[PDB]
Design a binder for these strands. Sequence first.
DNA 1: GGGAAGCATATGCTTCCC
DNA 2: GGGAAGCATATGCTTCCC
Lengths: 147, 147
Amino acid sequence: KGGWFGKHRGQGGSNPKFENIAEGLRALLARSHVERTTDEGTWVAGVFVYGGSKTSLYNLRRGTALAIPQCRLTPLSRLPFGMAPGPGPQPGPLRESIVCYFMVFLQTHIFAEVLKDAIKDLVMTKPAPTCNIRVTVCSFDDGVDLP
Amino acid sequence: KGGWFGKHRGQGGSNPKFENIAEGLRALLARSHVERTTDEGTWVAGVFVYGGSKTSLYNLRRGTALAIPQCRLTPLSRLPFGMAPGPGPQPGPLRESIVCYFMVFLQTHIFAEVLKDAIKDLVMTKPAPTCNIRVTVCSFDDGVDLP
DNA sequence: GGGAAGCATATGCTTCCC
DNA sequence: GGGAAGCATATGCTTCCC
């Protein structure tokens, strides 16, 4: 258990655990066959996913990759803190919490709203920490030119 | 040169290098003296910064921290690839590039729009790779509940 | 101020346990 | 399908180069 297997960052493949999550997402995405890709091929919309636990978000990230060939995903990363309570001292902009997040890039705003409804639906019937994963649609004013 | 200096992730302080960057950002933001915080204190918008090179983005990130105590910053992370041209297969949603990004969370959409302009203005006068840094405003439909 | 060094420690990945 | 182990290699952070 543990160690190196020869698979680098971003090289994760599929296994039954991730595929089960993918099949759950696919059944949910299938409630709305909306357009996922455009002629322009621009990444103008997204979905910001955060919370739950490190493993529950990681697992969601892996399953989404299998469920949607048309999206592009970031590695997991960390969120900074919000507003501290009171007229007291605020945390510095750079301070990081233990809470993770990841971003999903999509070509349409309509598909982004669908993915977001799928993730919230898939997670609402699960026990903590999974049920505590949060999601929001993100509109990029100028789009993101992914390399 | 190199090694441990007792400063953990998110603990960066200030030094003339980052203060110099901060001062340039400050002078630009001062022409547009808008509100940076709301009373509901919710994080509803952001500035998605990317490209350039790992160091120039990092330095911009540290300077932004000093210039804006009212914002919040994620660590640097990596961007997936985009669309391949042609009828063939596309890269997997998880594949990562060497290209970095970071996100600035803000309380108002007006201030994100102003912050974006200032960053584009700061960077456009400089040599490569810094002038290659890209910026876009991000609107969070349901906001982001920072820890 | 961009780039490199280099410790501490972050995630990406897999396989195993429950 | 959540949590952990544990190698490889990511960034955070500094000081020094230049």
